[PDB]
């Protein structure tokens, strides 16, 4: 990825995008439609990925 955008609200995230090694997590933002690199070890990301994997 790169660096990690700091303090991005969860409600501002449309969806997450995991890249194939070019963890690489990218968040699509709702207010400005940008793609931002998210920090993988944030608590709310780990819980988001669980809901998707049905766990």
């Amino acid at each position, epitope marked *: 990825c790169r660096f990690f955008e700091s*303090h*991005v*609200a*969860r*409600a*501002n995230v449309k969806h997450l995008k995991i890249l194939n090694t070019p963890l690489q997590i990218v968040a699509r933002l*709702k*207010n*400005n*439609n940008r793609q931002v690199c998210i920090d993988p070890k944030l608590k709310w990301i780990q819980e988001y990925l669980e809901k998707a994997l049905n766990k």
Partner: antibody
Amino acid sequence: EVQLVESGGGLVQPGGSLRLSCAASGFSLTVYSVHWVRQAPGKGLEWVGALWGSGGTEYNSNLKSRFTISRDTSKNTVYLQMNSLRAEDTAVYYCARDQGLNYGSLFDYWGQGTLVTVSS
Amino acid sequence: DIQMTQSPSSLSASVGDRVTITCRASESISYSLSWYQQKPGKAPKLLIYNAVKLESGVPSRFSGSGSGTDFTLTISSLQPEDFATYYCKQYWNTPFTFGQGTKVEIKR
């Protein structure tokens, strides 16, 4: 030079309907998101819903979808359709531009506000 | 639904007094909290975003701190034009929710 102007405020009967406007200049709705906020007279602030530049819509779930947010990019104007109003819907209705920072939704530019009164 | 709560509801201090306003969230909101100033008959004016960031044009006598469920807005030196109701807004989750406001009066 960003300027938001509301209009369409006025008296409505209970169970009645109304539409508001928000003409934006100095910036494009294609780049910036716009939000509706209402404030009952002498009360607190209430986030109605959001209209993204992408652009879809986000609503406050407590409103029972009795409101509809819409956009006409060719006019660069945002609307709010109000349906089956109650007395509790009497409030000043602001529109505010989303600053568009990655942090989240932040209202940097506001309109003067328009007042909807629901009474028989 | 995250409900925001502020303390106190009202306060009266003198020109030049430090004043703080507490903002509590019913649930953790990280650093996604903002502060708004609203004068009578006017629209709210954004002061602090991201808990501690002061936006352009706002006098640095305003200051913010906090995280999680506890936040606080500090006016380090009260001015006569600080008369207003101060709201905190949470943008961590939808619906975005406001505090009920804090009324600041000037003693003279």
